Structures are given as C-alpha cells and as structure tokens.
Write a protein that binds this ligand. Structure first.
Ligand SMILES: *[C@@H]1O[C@H](CO)[C@@H](O[C@@H]2O[C@H](CO)[C@@H](O)[C@H](O)[C@H]2NC(C)=O)[C@H](O)[C@H]1NC(C)=O
Ligand SMILES: *[C@@H]1O[C@H](CO)[C@@H](O)[C@H](O)[C@H]1NC(C)=O
Ligand SMILES: *[C@@H]1O[C@H](CO)[C@@H](O)[C@H](O)[C@H]1NC(C)=O
Lengths: 213, 215, 312
C-alpha cells in the first residue's frame, strides 16, 4: 500500500557526465531502500542496500543517499555500461509490490530528424491474401516520434504496430518501423497510402505516400 | 556465489512446467532464495521465497495457489512449478538470493541469469520473407512475417553488409505469430549495380531463406 | 464466445422485454443483445430487437482489431449500462460523430466520450448512412429482428466495478494527463487545456480510463496489471440446457455451499456433487492502472477514438 515512484521514467544524460536518479516513497521507509541495475538482457544486479551501503564488488562511482521519503542513486561519472534501467526497492514491509517502476538511462545527444521511407506491399506477398505497408523512421533523436497512417486521407486506428531499435552505439540515434496490415480486399479498395511523421527535429510534419500503381 | 537456471521453454496453455535454479559456492541451508518474474516490457514482480533450512515457503498473495516453490538441500536447488500455465505466463523468470531485514521484508543480493518461458497455442512455423523495395542514399529491407517462436536472425549478403543495418524487435501479432523487419541504408549509386540479399534464419523450424531485394 | 446463452432467435417483434433480477439472468440478457434492444425501444422509437442469431459475440467493433472482446466476460460500456454501473446517454445534436467506423446500415452504435458514453439510435425501418450523419429508410430492417451486424461498439474498452478515489487524487491525475497532451485544447466539446489558437475538431485515438469523475483521464505513458479477483461477480450460475438460474436459485448457490461448481467455485464458495452450477467468467481479471505515480482501479479502461481540437 506504500508506493515508490522513480521520476523521471527516462533520464537522458551525457556519457562522462553525472547521473542522479530519484526514488520517492509515499510513506517513510527509514533506510530500508535498495537499488538495482538491469543491463540489456542480463540478470539484475544489486548496487545499494540500506539506502547508502555499496554492495559487494560495485564500483565507487555509484553512491547511495537519503533516508525516509527521498532517495537518490548517483553515478559520479557515467560510463558506457552505465546506461541501463535502474530500480529502487523498499523492504519496510513485504507488500506485493515493493519495487519502483524503474528509470531508464539513455545517452543524451543533439536533436536529429528521422529520414522517412515508405514501402508498398511486395507483389509476392499480395498474392497470399494480406498487404503489409511499412514506414521506416531512420536515425533520429530524441526517441519521441509520432507516426500516423492515412489511407485515402482517412486516419487509421488499430491496424499498425511500431518497433524501435535500441540506441546506436556509434551515433546514439533511434530507428522506428511502423507496419500497417491490411487484407488484399481492403488494400485494393483504396488508392493513396500515406505515412505521416512528427518529430522535434522537423519544422513541419513529413509525409511519404504512394498510389497503388 | 552462483545461481544457474535451467534453459528456455516453449509450452502450450494448460500445461505443467518446473524450472530450476542450481546454487553453489555458499551453504544453501540458511539463505533465503525466491523467484521473481518480469513480464514482457514490464518491471519486476516477486512470486515467493523459501528458506531451505526449515522449509518456510511464503508466496506473494497474487501468486498464491498458482505455483509451487520448493527446495532440495542435497542439490542446493530451488524449483518453480505451475501445474497449469496460461498465456499470460509468458515472461522471464529469475531466481535470486534474498537477505532479510528482521521484522521487515527483504532485498535481493544475487540473481540467476533468467529463464524465458513462452506460453502459446501456436505451433512452430518458419517465417515468410517479403522484400521492401527502395522505389542520394536509398533504403531497402526485408519483411519477416508469421514465425513462431522467437528468434529469427537476419543478415545481409551472407554477413558482408554490416553498416547501416537495422533489424527491429519482433512483435506478437493478434494471430500469435511474430513479425519483424530488417532494413539497410545504401547509396543510390549501387542499386542496379550491387546485389542485395537478406538471409533469414529460424532455428526452431530448421528454415533458412535468402531473398533478393530489387528496384 | 458467449458467457451463458447461445444466440437468440426472436419471433415476436413486439414481445415484452422482462426486467429480470438475477445477476446471471441479466447477464444472459446482455449475452442476447437484449440490453441494446431495450435501448433502441426506450430512446429511438424502434420496434423489435438487434442481435438475432448473433448475440454479443457477433457485435461489430471499430477498430476491428479489438482485443477485449476475445474475452467473453469483459463488460462493454453498453453492458455496464444494463447492470447499473454507468449510463449510455442518448446522443444530442452537439455530440460529435467520429469518422472511421463503417457506419452504413448500423441501427445502434456507441462510443465513449470524454465526459461519458453516448449512443446513437435509428427508428423502425431505418438505418445509418455511410457517413453516420443520418437515419434513412432501409428495406432490410423491416423484419424488426436484426442481426448483430447492425450493432457497433466503437473502441477496445473494458468496464468493471471500480474502487473510488478522492477528488484530490483525481485532480492530481487530471493535471498529469494535461501535461502529456499540451497541444490539445478540447476533447469532445469539453475544455482540456486553455488555448489561443484552437483548430477544428479531428479524430483522436487515445488510451483513457474512467475513474468515476466528471471526465475521463486520457493517458499516454501508463501501465496496467490484471488481478483475478474471483469474487461473486466472477461466477455465473446456470441450469444446463435451460439457461441461467433465478435470483433465488443463484443467491442460494452463492450462500449455501450446496450446489455444483467448477474447481474455483468450490474453492471459494462451497461444493457438493440436478441443481444449478456456477462457473468463472472467462476474463483476465480486474484491471489496475499505474499513471503518473498513482495506482487506481478504474471503472472503465480502454483505447477509443474521440474528437479533439489542437492549438494554433
Ligand atoms: C550448513 O550449515 C548447517 C547449520 O549451520 C550445517 O548443518 C549442521 O552440521 C553440523 C556438522 O556439520 C551438525 O552437527 C548439525 O547437526 C547440523 N545441523 C543442521 C540443522 O543441519 C551443514 O552441515 C552446513 N552445510 C554445509 C555444506 O556447509
Ligand atoms: C406477441 O404479439 C402480440 C401482438 O403483437 C402481443 O399482444 C403479445 O403481447 C406478444 N407476446 C407477448 C409474450 O406478450
Ligand atoms: C428502458 O426503460 C425501462 C423502464 O424503466 C428500464 O427498466 C430499462 O432499464 C431501460 N433500458 C435501457 C437500456 O435504458
């Protein structure tokens, strides 16, 4: 019944810089707070327990502080492996959900606009009953991008799925793909298929479209 | 201190599973061990912990009646067991070693590597591969559609084209099948000169497909 | 699939519509699209029924990609209407009809709105134009026993018994939702953010929850968990071959410990193995939402299309 929120949900901070993650509790938990790091696709690792006691084998550049209602995980100078999801966890009682929701640490960089591509369904696929239309947002930053599909100028709902890559190691950008899925019946009943992309890095929304041809 | 978990599982809803966590390099009888689940794209949930000494087993109320955690001191090993899985059991599962805090709860001072448990009525099915045609720099890719289970691995020109490649995380469709794209950026010059071939792999189905992408 | 009752076959288009009392009785009503039938009679001067041969499991959805209807036991907004948890109001002239659904020929459609739930009906012998603007004479409605294809529920929505939250935490939520949608001015006619330049209304697909207050809480970055609560609403009682049990027959079975049930019914209420049987409704549970640092159990939760105006 005692709730822990880690805000922000995403902290964007430059490598080499200093990272300060917050964990705030809804009721005092004294110093019964622990902190975990969760690497991409590995096991979690304990960093801090007791709000400030460094766990065995953890680099000095991680430090814990706080007691009561405000807790901070600080990383003194960020290294490459340090970009990961960080969880806070209380043990004042043993409720069903003593974990915060986690904060994701990402590499901060300069705003970069996506390059947009749209692909019509292959002929080979269209013969098997379904038409899949793919929009590609390439190498942009920040991750927050908004993508809308419009067929014959009508907005779409329910017929698309977005996927995002992890951050590039070289330029630290993201790429996104949106796939719009339609049956040959519906796909052939319409003429203009248009991908509309909105992002901090564009002055105005970008459209890429095709006619069934 | 090492917690080593059993391998990955693909199971049908309505079925039984036992997954194990083998412990070593510390006396297994007086440390609490327990199991934590990470549902796809969610955070961490504890399921239940056990003290192998007196066999005191305690579950999270949400998991009570759904599972059995048990221990075997001779083998220093914990077990997690469902007698009937649902498709919402699809998750990663960790064993971990706990430390107590007297009257209070616990923290997790050591974690096993994870076990991915997928639960789905789908049979194994290899991907179908459709090209994304390109229509300065141009983009092109391969659509990889309706396979089960994960993973697939996509390469380009038998691994020679490595720069500018994005292979996306797959998605679960409404049909139960996974779907996923791989794209490349390429200079405009090369199309009509260079040949572009994506090579798709799906180990579970023993399928390998090579598709040529074209103007 | 269906909860209890297989597809209705009406023949008396003027037949009485009984107010039943059992939970499992009105559940079987809901199952037979009869709640939507009663709606059209009360508000739109319509003779008969919708749902013939089809029932609830053949109602149409927009988008067609709807996941909560793959669970028979999740309540659509019309269904919570027949059980008393909310009101699906008759459409006014100000209620904006949202573009995108295939409206042509529907006799009843419903959408969640920013401040409630609105239904539009058609009279006897009429159905909707393609745009959805009007009701016009239709030959295929003359029967007055119309198929489920004529009922449209806009959205992927689930409704449930809610846990009330205080005003303070509602305001506290309303502000976070404003923070994640700063270039919105109004939704469905209601002021969302203060603006100067506000555009014309346009389609707006969004996730939202109803927390039992003056309007919905629309959400961008939220999280949901489902808790199998296996309480008394989670079971329906029925007589195999002759349909649901009576208010009596059901209430005795949720109290006596004497009747038949499935594994979960015996475990929580009491078995003895004719008589009525009660079983769990097929659903993933009660939904709980995590948004902006609060954990709430809303009245309704889903992803629907509304009308909103943008900043200029
Ligand atoms: C782990 O520790 C336990 C208890 O501290 C050990 O069990 C005891 O072992 C001694 C001699 O080895 C006996 O005299 C006691 O009767 C045992 N007590 C119990 C409760 O088992 C155990 O041997 C240790 N195991 C390892 C592998 O170190
Ligand atoms: C059947 O129709 C007749 C005439 O329309 C009506 O009087 C009667 O009430 C209807 N059935 C029942 C059960 O009332
Ligand atoms: C229609 O009116 C009757 C009469 O009060 C009422 O019992 C019933 O609940 C109403 N149905 C709907 C769907 O409003």
């Amino acid at each position: 019944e005692i709730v822990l929120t880690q805000s922000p949900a995403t902290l964007s901070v430059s490598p080499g810089e200093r990272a300060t993650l917050s964990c705030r509790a809804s009721q005092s938990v004294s110093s019964n707070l622990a902190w975990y790091q969760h690497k991409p696709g590995q096991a979690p690792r304990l960093l801090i327990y007791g709000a400030f006691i460094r766990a065995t084998g953890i680099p000095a550049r991680f430090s814990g502080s706080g007691s009561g209602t405000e807790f901070t995980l600080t990383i003194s100078s960020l290294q490459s492996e340090d970009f990961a999801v960080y969880y806070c966890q209380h043990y004042n009682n043993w409720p069903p959900n003593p974990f915060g929701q986690g904060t994701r640490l990402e590499i901060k960089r300069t705003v970069a606009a996506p390059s947009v591509f749209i692909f019509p369904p292959s002929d080979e696929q269209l013969k098997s009953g379904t038409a899949s239309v793919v929009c590609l947002l390439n190498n942009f930053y920040p991750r927050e991008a908004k993508v809308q599909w419009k067929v014959d100028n009508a907005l779409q709902s329910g017929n698309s799925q977005e996927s995002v890559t992890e951050q590039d190691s070289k330029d630290s950008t993201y790429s996104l793909s949106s796939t719009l899925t339609l049956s040959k019946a519906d796909y052939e009943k319409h003429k203009v298929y248009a991908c509309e992309v909105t992002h901090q890095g564009l002055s105005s929304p970008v459209t890429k479209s095709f006619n069934r041809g | 201190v090492q917690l080593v978990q059993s391998g990955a599982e693909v199971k049908k809803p309505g079925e039984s599973l036992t997954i194990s966590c083998e412990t070593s390099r510390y006396n297994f009888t007086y440390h609490w061990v327990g199991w934590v689940r990470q549902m796809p794209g969610e955070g961490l949930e504890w399921m239940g912990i056990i003290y192998p000494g007196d066999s005191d087993t305690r579950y999270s109320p949400s998991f009570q009646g759904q599972i059995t955690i048990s221990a075997d001191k001779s083998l220093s090993t914990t077990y997690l067991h469902w007698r009937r899985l649902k498709a919402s059991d699809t998750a990663i599962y960790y064993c971990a070693r706990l430390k107590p805090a007297w009257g209070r709860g616990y923290y997790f001072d050591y974690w096993g590597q994870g076990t991915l448990v997928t639960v789905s009525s789908a049979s194994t099915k290899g991907p179908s591969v459709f090209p994304l045609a390109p229509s300065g720099t141009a983009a092109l890719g391969c659509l990889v559609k309706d396979y089960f289970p994960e993973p697939v691995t996509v390469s380009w020109n038998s691994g020679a084209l490595t720069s500018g490649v994005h292979t996306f995380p797959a998605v679960l469709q409404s049909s139960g099948l996974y779907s996923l794209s791989s794209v490349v950026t390429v200079p405009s010059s090369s199309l009509g000169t260079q040949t572009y071939i994506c090579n798709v792999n799906h180990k579970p189905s023993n399928t390998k497909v090579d598709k040529k992408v074209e103007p | 699939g269906p909860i209890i009752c297989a597809g209705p076959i009406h023949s008396n288009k003027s037949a009485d519509i009984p107010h039943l009392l059992g939970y499992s009785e009105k559940i079987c009503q809901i199952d037979r699209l009869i709640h939507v039938s009663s709606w059209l009679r009360n508000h739109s001067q319509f003779q008969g029924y919708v749902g013939q041969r089809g029932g609830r499991s053949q109602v149409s959805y927009y988008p067609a990609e709807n996941s909560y209807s793959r669970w028979s036991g999740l309540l659509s907004p019309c269904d919570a209407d027949w059980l008393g948890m909310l009101v699906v109001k008759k459409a006014k002239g100000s209620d904006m009809i949202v573009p995108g659904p295939s409206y042509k020929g529907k006799v009843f459609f419903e959408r969640p709105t920013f401040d409630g739930y609105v239904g539009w009906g058609c009279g006897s012998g009429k159905s909707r134009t393609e745009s959805g603007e009007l009701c016009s004479s239709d030959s295929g409605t003359s029967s007055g026993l119309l198929p489920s294809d004529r009922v449209l529920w806009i959205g992927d929505v689930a409704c449930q018994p809610m846990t009330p939250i205080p005003e303070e935490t509602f305001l506290e939520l309303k502000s976070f939702s404003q923070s994640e949608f700063p270039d919105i001015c109004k939704i469905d006619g209601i002021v969302f953010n203060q603006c100067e330049g506000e555009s014309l209304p346009q389609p707006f697909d969004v996730a939202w929850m109803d927390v039992g207050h003056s309007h919905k809480i629309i959400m961008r970055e939220h999280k949901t968990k489902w808790v199998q609560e296996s309480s008394s609403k989670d079971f329906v009682c029925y007589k195999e071959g002759t349909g649901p049990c009576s208010e009596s027959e059901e209430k005795t079975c949720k109290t006596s410990g004497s009747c038949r049930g499935d594994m979960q019914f015996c475990k929580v209420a009491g078995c003895e193995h004719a008589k009525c049987r009660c079983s769990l409704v097929h659903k993933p549970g009660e939904v709980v939402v995590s948004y902006g640092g609060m954990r709430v159990r809303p009245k309704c939760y889903g992803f629907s299309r509304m009308m909103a105006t943008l900043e200029v």
